[PDB]
């Protein structure tokens with residue numbers, strides 16, 4: 001609901017993103033997210049960005065797409 | 071549309087490109103574009119190149135490919 | 141006939157394939173090809189590799205599978 | 211079997227995975243595998259990880275997803 | 281006092297650092313910093329990291345060294 | 351003169367600067383320059399920036415610092 | 421010391437190196453090392469290579485050079 | 491005598507120099523050199539370039555200036 005189905009279906013909060021597709025210092029949101037705006041608000045708590053990644057687990061560098069409505 | 075569906079589906083005007091994969095100084099076109107001609111002309115306004123990138127938001131370096139219809 | 145029908149059904153000559161599914165610097169064959177041997181010979185004219193991609197037009201990076209009878 | 215049907219359907223033992231979708235130094239399992247745990251155990255014989263890649267042939271770097279239940 | 285004299289003498293708060301020498305999404309601290317610990321505390325307010333960069337002005341990507349005592 | 355003595359003592363007009371220390375597409379000023387403003391004005395004739403680089407010869411990419419008072 | 425003074429003055433044990441400039445999977449040596457022999461032996465404990473890097477803190481990818489005395 | 495005295499006073503043969511001051515893949519000349527012409531000829535034996543660096547020992551990346559009488 002906050003991320004599209006398929007490859008980039010895992011929501012994560014990352015310190016930043018490079019090249020338009022790589023999230024850096026990513027972590028699963030600390031709490032549940034229900035929509036684009038809430039997703040963005042949770043990540044902003046730690047100064048992070050909302051991204052939709054290919055992996056369900058935290059990672060220093062993961063392929064991720066920009067979030068929609070975030 | 072002006073960009074293929076999938077990964078590189080985001081139109082952007084970039085100052086240049088390198089390695090045939092990375093656009094530099096990229097920002098969303100100032101106005102709507104409906105075909106390869108529009109896309110090329112609009113980006114030329116700032117002397118930029120029309121590219122199809124992996125992210126819908128401006129960025130200094132993004133993975134991008136040359137627009138096919140322009 | 142040179143490429144399986146479906147997703148990767150468009151023959152192209154690419155400088156190389158990476159990550160097992162991405163063709164870089166791809167272009168439509170200069171001449172017509174009717175079988176694996178033709179595909180290989182026509183692409184080899186420019187030091188290219190024969191691949192079956194999803195897109196009909198040329199592209200600096202496309203989703204492609206190695207040609208069947210390369 | 212041990213990998214879902216589709217693009218990422220080829221079992222491989224790779225030294226590791228980066229960006230959450232790329233296996234490095236991948237090789238086909240030496241022996242057949244029948245389930246997650248089995249797949250994992252075999253790849254562990256060479257200190258490798260069990261992944262499902264886009265190609266049936268070994269490669270220094272390939273697109274792969276982690277094996278389910280492995 | 282928070283950064284060494286020379287090339288990397290400009291304190292900045294950045295979203296992260298790559299390759300051990302490149303700060304990403306950097307900005308001059310919002311307030312004055314007097315020591316390593318205070319520098320680190322100010323940057324942590326926005327979830328940023330304390331770095332010593334070659335430029336006195338904010339930048340999306342700048343050469344920066346890890347901070348000492350931070 | 352317009353650049354400090356030492357490593358970064360060679361005046362150049364470069365299309366731009368990245369990472370806060372690298373000038374791209376640099377060329378020696380067409381005419382002599384005597385101070386910050388002068389240096390800047392000249393480089394502006396070709397849409398370039400005034401920088402102090404480590405080498406007296408033009409280059410696609412060189413280590414350079416911004417010109418003081420320019 | 422074990423690493424030259426300057427930019428690459430931080431000893432680290434890394435899983436490997438690429439392009440003769442980037443160390444991968446790097447962490448500070450578990451114990452003190454006073455020369456090239458110590459450095460090499462200590463890193464061998466985890467099958468790692470002794471490198472001199474630009475950052476004093478562990479990281480998955482850092483700019484590093486081979487240790488001269490090891 | 492082949493390199494100016496001081497900082498960059500150690501002759502080395504490097505695959506190339508980048509950014510106007512960095513020698514990559516540098517090694518001490520195989521034979522002795524007594525003048526610019528010798529330096530150039532001895533390095534050219536391995537397709538290398540003659541540079542004057544700060545370090546006496548070999549290195550994958552060092553601070554170097556182009557040889558005076560290359």
Ligand SMILES: CCCCCCCCCCCC[N+](C)(C)[O-]
Nearest residue numbers: 018019022061156158229298481
């Ligand atoms: C942010 C990660 C960027 C990784 C970039 C990796 C580039 C690899 C280029 C390999 C080129 C190999 N070859 C044989 C064509 O020279």
Ligand SMILES: CCCCCCCCCCCC[N+](C)(C)[O-]
Nearest residue numbers: 075076077133162194201202203
């Ligand atoms: C950075 C390398 C990126 C390669 C990206 C390849 C994207 C392929 C998208 C294919 C979409 C195919 N189809 C039939 C669904 O339109």
Ligand SMILES: CCCCCCCCCCCC[N+](C)(C)[O-]
Nearest residue numbers: 007063076077147203217231273
């Ligand atoms: C390093 C980037 C790799 C990107 C790989 C992208 C694979 C996309 C596959 C899309 C398949 C779509 N359908 C629509 C499922 O073909």
Ligand SMILES: CCCCCCCCCCCC[N+](C)(C)[O-]
Nearest residue numbers: 086087088094341368369372374
């Ligand atoms: C962090 C380092 C970034 C370096 C970026 C270098 C961009 C070079 C672009 C050269 C473009 C050349 N040309 C002819 C296509 O305009």
Ligand SMILES: CCCCCCCCCCCC[N+](C)(C)[O-]
Nearest residue numbers: 019021022089091133155164229
């Ligand atoms: C996931 C981020 C990947 C960034 C990859 C950048 C790849 C650049 C490849 C350049 C290849 C150039 N050449 C001449 C060897 O074809």
Ligand SMILES: CCCCCCCCCCCC[N+](C)(C)[O-]
Nearest residue numbers: 018019022088089091092131298
């Ligand atoms: C942030 C990603 C940067 C990727 C840079 C990739 C550079 C590839 C250079 C390939 C050069 C190939 N060749 C044949 C011209 O030497």
Ligand SMILES: CCCCCCCCCCCC[N+](C)(C)[O-]
Nearest residue numbers: 018085094095130131341366368
């Ligand atoms: C890990 C990726 C780090 C990327 C650092 C990129 C710095 C890019 C600077 C691009 C400047 C482009 N332009 C057109 C303004 O010259």
Ligand SMILES: CCCCCCCCCCCC[N+](C)(C)[O-]
Nearest residue numbers: 018019088089092130131132410
């Ligand atoms: C963050 C993106 C950084 C991109 C850096 C791209 C460097 C490209 C260098 C290309 C050199 C090509 N050539 C023909 C002169 O060897």
Ligand SMILES: CCCCCCCCCCCC[N+](C)(C)[O-]
Nearest residue numbers: 091133158159162201269270271
């Ligand atoms: C954005 C797409 C980036 C693709 C980068 C691909 C790097 C491929 C390196 C392949 C090396 C192959 N081999 C056989 C020489 O080991």
Ligand SMILES: CCCCCCCCCCCC[N+](C)(C)[O-]
Nearest residue numbers: 159228229232234235270271438
């Ligand atoms: C995101 C692209 C990552 C590309 C990584 C390519 C690694 C190539 C390693 C080649 C190693 C070759 N050899 C002979 C030393 O085993």
Ligand SMILES: CCCCCCCCCCCC[N+](C)(C)[O-]
Nearest residue numbers: 018131298299302341369506508
């Ligand atoms: C985070 C920025 C990384 C930038 C990496 C730039 C690599 C440029 C390699 C240029 C190689 C040129 N040449 C002629 C030797 O092939």
Ligand SMILES: CCCCCCCCCCCC[N+](C)(C)[O-]
Nearest residue numbers: 409410411441483508509512551
């Ligand atoms: C970590 C050091 C990275 C150095 C990267 C240097 C890239 C140099 C590209 C030089 C291109 C020179 N030339 C003449 C072909 O334009």
Ligand SMILES: CCCCCCCCCCCC[N+](C)(C)[O-]
Nearest residue numbers: 088368369372374375410411509
């Ligand atoms: C951080 C290293 C950045 C290296 C950037 C290298 C850019 C090389 C651009 C070469 C352009 C050559 N040419 C013929 C197209 O003008």
Ligand SMILES: CCCCCCCCCCCC[N+](C)(C)[O-]
Nearest residue numbers: 425426427483512544551552553
């Ligand atoms: C990523 C390329 C890095 C090149 C780094 C060169 C660092 C040189 C440090 C030289 C220190 C010289 N000295 C005499 C002060 O020891």
Ligand SMILES: CCCCCCCCCCCC[N+](C)(C)[O-]
Nearest residue numbers: 287343357371413426427497553
């Ligand atoms: C892309 C990285 C470039 C690093 C350039 C580093 C230059 C260091 C110069 C150090 C000079 C030291 N003394 C001690 C002033 O020679």
Ligand SMILES: CCCCCCCCCCCC[N+](C)(C)[O-]
Nearest residue numbers: 061228229232234436437438444
């Ligand atoms: C974000 C992409 C990161 C790709 C990292 C690829 C590392 C390849 C290391 C190959 C090492 C080969 N060898 C023989 C030195 O062990």
